[PDB]
């Protein structure tokens, strides 16, 4: 059996928090992938107080 | 038996929080994938306080 | 047995949260995938206190 | 057995909460897709205090 | 039996936190993978109090 | 027995809030005077978030 | 017995507070008094945030 | 018995506060005066997060 | 028995907080007193994050 | 028995906080006084966090 429980509130409750992001030309090419890939939180361009829980089992035949 | 409990309310509750995201030109090209891929939080433009949670079990044949 | 209990309101009760949210040419062009894809919040614009989750177990076969 | 309940009122109830979102050419064609694809919330262009969830057991065949 | 329960309130509760993320021209070229790869909290962009889990088990046959 | 007990926190909670004060010539006298006098919060400028509590039973012979 | 446990923390959480003051010539006189007097909060200039407490029996025997 | 336990930690928590005091020509004046006085904050300036307790039973015998 | 005790660490928490004073000829005059006087914080000038307590039992037999 | 105990760390914990002073020609005069005078903390000048106690039984007998 699984299981992944999370806790109670989170959040700010404090000071000043400033996040700047400014890229300029960031390219991501990918391809040709075979197998699975799981995960919790990607976060690509601006994150803040993001949380992501995953589970998967997956069967891949060819 | 799976599962993922989450808590009480989560939120900001404190003092100052600024987030400016200017790219310029971001390119994500992606071709010729396969397999399952799972995710809790994708976060690619701008995100705060957010929750994602994903529970998956696919079966992919060819 | 699954499930995924959430628990009480959220939300800002604190002070300020500001968010700009400028890109010039983001492009983000996809094409011949395979396989599932699960995802609990997926954020490609501006997202504030979004909660999402998601459960699937599909069978695709070719 | 599945579900997946979401408990009592959520929503600001605090101070300021402003947000700007002035993309300027956002492109994003996507071609060519095989499978499924679940999510719980997909925000692709302005959201606040946003919540969705998903269940799915889909049968493609080819 | 696994299981990965979390801790309670998280967040900024002090003084000044500030964030610059300006990147030249990032390029991620990735190609012909074989393999599962799972992860706990990926953060390509800018992420701040980011909290990410995964639990997986994959069976990929060829 | 007595008790004024005074709890909460308390203060500006967002939104915007002005004060102003431009009186001329004010004047203000009390020549002879004579007796017991107690007053819980007495303002003569601006004021603003001001709390004050007061207690007290002399005993005055003439 | 007596006692005023004030209590909790308090102060701005947020917003604008603006305070003005330009009285031009204020006056004030008294003359002759005689007796107690016993004030919580007193403020002739511009005060904002203030708290104040006060607990007194004198015995006079003129 | 007595006390006033004054409690909890206070203080500016976000936001914008900006107090001004330009009074011209300010008078005061008291010739003669007796007996108790007993106050809990006086201000005849500024002022800001100010916080003020007084104790007293003088026996005055004239 | 008496006593006041304060508690907690207290003081500024982020944010702007500007302070002004320019009085042109205040004045203060008081000639002739007799008696007890009690006080908890007296500001004459700026102030700030002031504290101030006091406990005073005299005994005065002219 | 009496006792203050005050308590905590306390301090400026970030933000901006900017006091300015320019009186012209402040006055203050006091010809006859006679009595008590306990105060917990008085201040003339700027001040900022400045935190102050007293205690006094004077027996004083013309």
């Known amino acids: 059996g699984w299981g ?3 806790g ?3 959040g700010q409750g ?3 928090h400033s996040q700047w992001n400014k890229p ?3 390219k ?3 391809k040709h992938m075979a197998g699975a ?3 919790g939180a990607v976060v690509g361009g601006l994150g ?3 949380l992501g829980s995953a589970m998967s089992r997956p ?3 060819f």
Request: no cysteine.
């Open 37 to 39: 890939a799981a995960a």
């Open 59 to 61: 069967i891949i035949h």
């Open 28 to 30: 991501t090419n990918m």
């Open 48 to 50: 803040g107080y993001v």
């Open 24 to 26: 300029s030309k960031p």
């Open 8 to 10: 109670g509130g989170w």
């Open 4 to 6: 992944q429980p999370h």
């Open 14 to 16: 404090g000071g000043t």
